[PDB]
Design a protein around this motif. Sequence first.
Motif, short mmCIF file in Angstrom:
data_model
loop_
_atom_site.label_atom_id
_atom_site.label_comp_id
_atom_site.label_asym_id
_atom_site.label_seq_id
_atom_site.Cartn_x
_atom_site.Cartn_y
_atom_site.Cartn_z
N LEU A 89 0.83 -1.10 0.09
CA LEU A 89 0.03 -0.03 -0.07
C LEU A 89 1.03 1.31 0.04
CD1 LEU A 89 -2.78 1.46 0.23
CD2 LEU A 89 -2.95 1.09 2.55
N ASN A 90 1.91 1.25 0.71
CA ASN A 90 2.98 2.38 0.77
C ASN A 90 3.98 2.26 -0.26
OD1 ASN A 90 2.08 4.07 2.75
ND2 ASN A 90 2.67 2.94 4.50
N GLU A 91 4.92 1.14 -0.12
CA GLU A 91 6.19 0.86 -0.94
C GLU A 91 6.78 -0.39 -0.48
OE1 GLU A 91 7.31 1.16 2.62
OE2 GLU A 91 6.94 3.04 2.03
N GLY A 106 20.09 1.15 -1.28
CA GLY A 106 19.06 0.38 -1.63
C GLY A 106 18.34 1.22 -2.85
N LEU A 107 16.85 0.69 -2.87
CA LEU A 107 16.00 1.27 -3.91
C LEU A 107 14.56 1.12 -3.19
CD1 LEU A 107 17.43 0.10 -7.39
CD2 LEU A 107 17.41 2.35 -6.45
N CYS A 108 13.76 2.22 -3.69
CA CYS A 108 12.51 2.31 -3.23
C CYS A 108 11.48 2.55 -4.24
CB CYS A 108 12.15 3.24 -2.11
SG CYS A 108 10.46 3.60 -1.53
N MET A 109 10.58 1.43 -4.48
CA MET A 109 9.34 1.64 -5.27
C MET A 109 8.19 1.91 -4.34
SD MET A 109 8.64 1.45 -8.56
CE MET A 109 9.86 0.73 -9.41
N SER A 110 7.50 3.16 -4.79
CA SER A 110 6.33 3.58 -3.98
C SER A 110 5.21 3.70 -4.81
CB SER A 110 6.76 4.81 -3.48
OG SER A 110 5.78 5.29 -2.70
N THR A 111 3.85 3.39 -3.80
CA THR A 111 2.77 3.54 -4.52
C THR A 111 2.34 5.11 -4.54
OG1 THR A 111 1.60 3.52 -2.46
CG2 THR A 111 1.88 1.41 -3.55
N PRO A 112 1.60 5.32 -5.45
CA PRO A 112 1.13 6.98 -5.17
C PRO A 112 0.79 7.54 -4.01
CG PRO A 112 -0.04 5.79 -7.22
CD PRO A 112 0.76 4.76 -6.44
N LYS A 160 23.31 -11.73 -3.78
CA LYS A 160 22.16 -12.27 -4.16
C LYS A 160 21.17 -12.61 -3.01
N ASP A 161 21.74 -12.00 -1.81
CA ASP A 161 20.74 -11.89 -0.61
C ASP A 161 20.52 -10.51 -0.13
OD1 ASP A 161 21.44 -14.86 -0.48
OD2 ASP A 161 22.89 -14.65 0.72
N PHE A 162 19.14 -10.38 -0.38
CA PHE A 162 18.61 -8.75 -0.06
C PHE A 162 17.50 -8.70 1.12
CE2 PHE A 162 20.24 -9.40 -4.53
CZ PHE A 162 21.03 -8.32 -4.73
N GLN A 163 17.68 -7.57 1.70
CA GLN A 163 16.40 -7.46 2.54
C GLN A 163 15.43 -6.84 1.67
OE1 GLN A 163 15.50 -7.12 5.96
NE2 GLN A 163 16.70 -8.82 6.69
N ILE A 164 14.35 -7.56 1.34
CA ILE A 164 13.13 -7.03 0.89
C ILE A 164 12.16 -6.59 1.99
CG2 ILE A 164 11.23 -7.33 -0.87
CD1 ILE A 164 13.25 -9.40 -2.18
N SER A 165 11.41 -5.39 1.83
CA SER A 165 10.64 -4.94 2.63
C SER A 165 9.54 -4.28 2.29
CB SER A 165 11.39 -3.72 3.59
OG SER A 165 10.31 -3.23 4.52
N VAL A 166 8.35 -4.90 2.57
CA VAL A 166 6.89 -4.62 1.83
C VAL A 166 6.17 -4.28 2.94
CG1 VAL A 166 4.99 -5.35 0.82
CG2 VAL A 166 7.21 -6.39 0.08
N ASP A 167 6.09 -2.69 3.06
CA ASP A 167 5.33 -1.99 4.20
C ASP A 167 5.85 -2.30 5.32
OD1 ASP A 167 3.72 -0.87 2.21
OD2 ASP A 167 2.23 -2.34 2.65
N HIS A 168 7.24 -2.17 5.50
CA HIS A 168 8.18 -2.27 6.59
C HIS A 168 8.06 -3.94 7.06
CE1 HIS A 168 9.69 -0.22 10.80
NE2 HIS A 168 10.49 -0.68 9.99
N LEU A 169 7.46 -4.72 6.29
CA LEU A 169 7.86 -5.88 6.63
C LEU A 169 8.89 -6.61 5.89
CD1 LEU A 169 6.48 -8.74 7.93
CD2 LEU A 169 5.08 -8.91 5.94
N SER A 170 10.14 -6.37 6.69
CA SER A 170 11.33 -6.72 5.79
C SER A 170 11.54 -8.34 6.11
CB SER A 170 12.34 -5.85 6.47
OG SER A 170 13.64 -5.90 5.77
N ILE A 171 11.72 -8.87 5.04
CA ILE A 171 11.99 -10.31 5.03
C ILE A 171 13.48 -10.68 4.38
CG2 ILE A 171 11.39 -12.73 4.38
CD1 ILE A 171 9.41 -11.03 5.78
#
Lengths: 253, 260, 263, 260
Positions: free
Chosen positions: A111-113, A141-147, A205-216
Amino acid sequence: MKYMITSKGDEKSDLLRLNMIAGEYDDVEPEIVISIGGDGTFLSAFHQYEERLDEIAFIGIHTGHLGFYADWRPAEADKLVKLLAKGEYQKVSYPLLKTTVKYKEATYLALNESTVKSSGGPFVVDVVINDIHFERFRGDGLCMSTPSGTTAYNKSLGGALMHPSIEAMQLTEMASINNRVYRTIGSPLVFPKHHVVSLQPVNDKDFQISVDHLSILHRDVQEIRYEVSAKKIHFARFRSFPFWRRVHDSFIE
Amino acid sequence: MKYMITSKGDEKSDLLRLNMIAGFGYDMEYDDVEPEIVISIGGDGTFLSAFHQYEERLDEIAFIGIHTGHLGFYADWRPAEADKLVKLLAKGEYQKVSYPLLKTTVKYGKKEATYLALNESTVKSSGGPFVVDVVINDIHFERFRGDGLCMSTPSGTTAYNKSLGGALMHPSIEAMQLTEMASINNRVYRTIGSPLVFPKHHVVSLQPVNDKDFQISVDHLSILHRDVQEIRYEVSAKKIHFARFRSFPFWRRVHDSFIE
Amino acid sequence: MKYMITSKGDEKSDLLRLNMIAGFGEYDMEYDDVEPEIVISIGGDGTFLSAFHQYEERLDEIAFIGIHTGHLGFYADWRPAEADKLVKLLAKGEYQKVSYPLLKTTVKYGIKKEATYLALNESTVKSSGGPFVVDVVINDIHFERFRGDGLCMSTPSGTTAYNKSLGGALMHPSIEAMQLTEMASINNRVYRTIGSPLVFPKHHVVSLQPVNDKDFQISVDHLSILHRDVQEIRYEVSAKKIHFARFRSFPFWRRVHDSFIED
Amino acid sequence: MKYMITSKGDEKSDLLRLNMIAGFGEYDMEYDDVEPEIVISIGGDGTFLSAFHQYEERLDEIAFIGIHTGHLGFYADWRPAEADKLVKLLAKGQKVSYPLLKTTVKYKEATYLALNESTVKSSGPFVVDVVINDIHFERFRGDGLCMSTPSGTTAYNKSLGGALMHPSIEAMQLTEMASINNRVYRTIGSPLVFPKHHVVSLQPVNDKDFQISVDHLSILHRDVQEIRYEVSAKKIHFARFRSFPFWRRVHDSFIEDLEH
Ligand SMILES: Nc1ncnc2c1nc(SCC(=O)NCCc1cccc(Br)c1)n2[C@@H]1O[C@H](CO)[C@@H](O)[C@H]1O
Ligand SMILES: Nc1ncnc2c1nc(SCC(=O)NCCc1cccc(Br)c1)n2[C@@H]1O[C@H](CO)[C@@H](O)[C@H]1O
Ligand SMILES: Nc1ncnc2c1nc(SCC(=O)NCCc1cccc(Br)c1)n2[C@@H]1O[C@H](CO)[C@@H](O)[C@H]1O
Ligand SMILES: Nc1ncnc2c1nc(SCC(=O)NCCc1cccc(Br)c1)n2[C@@H]1O[C@H](CO)[C@@H](O)[C@H]1O
């Protein structure tokens, strides 16, 4: 009108919830989700029903500061319960971000980024836009955001604030070294519908992917793909609170 | 069909122009009154001049850009491909791609002036400090102070907008972007700082405070406007039309410009 | 002590000016706008800049004092109500001098001869029409080729002005240096620039050399004049410093705090 | 005199290391890896950072030399092919000193010496008060704060939008990291350069658990009451033989390197 109410965890959030539950309740098949707490609490309510976003209208109530999602004052609850049961209310649709991890796919909704960090060392990837190489990134890192998520982490990173009525996604850099070898665009990038940003690893090849602060902590990552999701989040519109007003009250007082 | 070609001025543009005109000696006739195809040879600035030269009949004109110098975002066809372009449009075998435009309205205190922008529309002061109120949809947002403001088209985001720290937009997104020019956030004049992307049917109104004289520039056509009451920004309903023959992606063109 | 007072021109400044002059008359204070040892600026920062340039040939025999009739300024940091206590401290000579670094700007032509300008805030160079294209040569070595609106070299005390609005860093005035900031650089593959603000120490020369157009709009402390047939524009920290008569202790960072955060 | 050589890890850094050790044996050069007068780093800036902290207790009698096995570094400015000349110049017998950042943490008072920068993040939301010379300035909220050395401005500082500062200037620069600047938390936005004897006191607001990283030596400190910053009296010494200006290294790193 089958509804469902979430709560933060504090006394007030669990009390006002009871003041609204008095005036059918279905947590498995909801059509009206009422979030009580803040924006972070609203995000948890969003992730709880990703599979059925096309049948749910959301309502945010803030027991704290004014949020871009939780905007309704606690005193409005007495009038909020009657209007929702009236049956007559128009919905407002906001775009969402799809995040796929390749190794067997792994799709995510934001919903956020959705940010991609490193799992310790430097973050070095190749940015591929529509099967065409754009740049080789090196930095944090990088950040892809929703409107709608532009007012969040995106703004702090120097991103542009875009109105949620625009169906697009915004990519912003996170401390790029931007030198000879790793020349980056610097400017934030706004991609429309059907545009795919493919992040491809150089090493690690090991990255910290975070979807709405849910960082896996994803391991063995070969590709990360971003695109404007087909699914949209619906808000129950009763009053009139313009997006730019919410931005003004937040940052401009 | 009818066509015409504009030139930058240098020998490279005028010579290449005459070489292409002779190539249409097919069923193509030269006409600079009611053309169906307009070719720009030189740079992006040359293309912008061809836009305003025929902004009265945009809905019946397909533009083609040719860059004699470095790569442009409008002029993206290399002079080496000038031979193929003549035959390509001669048969009429091509598609049409449209980019959004920006409408600028200036009200006084009288009439009013309307302008169309392919790149951007900027408003600065006539010497001293630039102090205005930013009004979004009849609602106050901020009081600006500094050099000026820049409302950019999606295709114009890669121009002045980018140098001002603005965000890049794909020209398929019908919208407009507002970026600051050296704002002074000193608690008295709080500004958002971040670039603002406005969708269609949204009106960004710039209302003066003390001084009422502003330097309004539409694609580097700056003329002084005295006694200004209001400057309104919104996405125009009119669209520019390109005649894309091959496939030159917007982001790929961005890569060749800044990344390489 | 020879002194003089500049005024913003409004009612409050002119009025306060007259009363201060009469205040100095009670002591051993002679009014002189030709060879003063004390220069008082009643108005704002813009008024202070005029007073500085008015006596940019006597910067060593002058201790500037700023009074703000309106909002707080980084130069004018004295409230009008403190003009009475200001005189009694000036008359006795009960004060110490604090010095801020200055920026030197040297313009060379197709030699008509040469031109040098001192700046308290900053010195900017822009084009006279089309694009601004110059080669940035740092200490006889080429650094980059610029294309855009222009370039801004700022003084330490001038960092809180135009420099900050251009994304420049805020420096403490005790640091003898200068800061170069970009003005809308195109920053592509042909005109690759650093993007970041550059802070040059003393004895470091930044040379701006034309590529095509030789006409440049040079503005020293918002005194913009057109220079034609320019061959070179040199930037370096001057050996001359502006002197302030310090009585109390107004922190530079607090002035930043009161101006950009809250007060 | 006494010397030593630190290596990165790969075969390239080790093979070049042995080649130098051999050459110095032909000259009057003692070999000590505990108490040397000359420390040579082979690899990159990260390798040099290790060589700094490995002997940060004897910075007074040590002149460092950097060799980059890969791309050009700001501390490793000597080429692998120039190693033969390096052995000769060091054997026959100018010195340059750079300022250092002193990081003090109070919960026991821990002292840290940074060559590049010293960042302070949280553990979620990072919220601290910024105090400059015993007075309040702002309340920060975001990812964290970054205090950098003059020689460290070209590192993390440059990527955060900080200004590049010449090492001749004894100072320190503070930059923001993804700061959310709104009504409640209003920050300066601009990077801040501090001279000597200027102390920047970082004091907690909510949680006392902050992540302190001194030259990528990220250590989680617990129950922190204050984090101080000041220009350290300690200065790192370098060995000079060939004029390689700081602005040149900046140019050859971020702009272009046509001869490579
Ligand atoms: N984004 C940065 N850009 C340019 N320098 C950085 C950056 N980040 C740090 S360290 C902060 C950090 O851990 N960032 C996570 C990703 C990362 C790690 C190490 C290097 C890089 Br690059 C990226 N540095 C510099 O790395 C040096 C240590 O090797 C430190 O001086 C940082 O200044
Ligand atoms: N600096 C940010 N500014 C404005 N939005 C942010 C920020 N940082 C994140 S999360 C990334 C993060 O871990 N940053 C380190 C410090 C921190 C952590 C959480 C919140 C905050 Br605030 C700061 N956000 C947004 O908070 C949303 C709700 O969790 C996240 O989705 C980010 O969008
Ligand atoms: N955008 C700026 N932001 C914060 N300080 C500035 C700015 N711009 C300048 S002058 C450059 C200029 O011609 N700007 C056009 C509009 C303008 C003019 C004067 C003041 C202002 Br504010 C705006 N200044 C400072 O004004 C002082 C003159 O009194 C100079 O020292 C500039 O530093
Ligand atoms: N700094 C800019 N960066 C990248 N695009 C710009 C810029 N500046 C303008 S125009 C604004 C202006 O008058 N700038 C003064 C100096 C200048 C003039 C023309 C081009 C250039 Br480059 C510089 N442009 C774009 O050039 C088009 C003019 O043909 C305008 O539409 C801007 O989009």
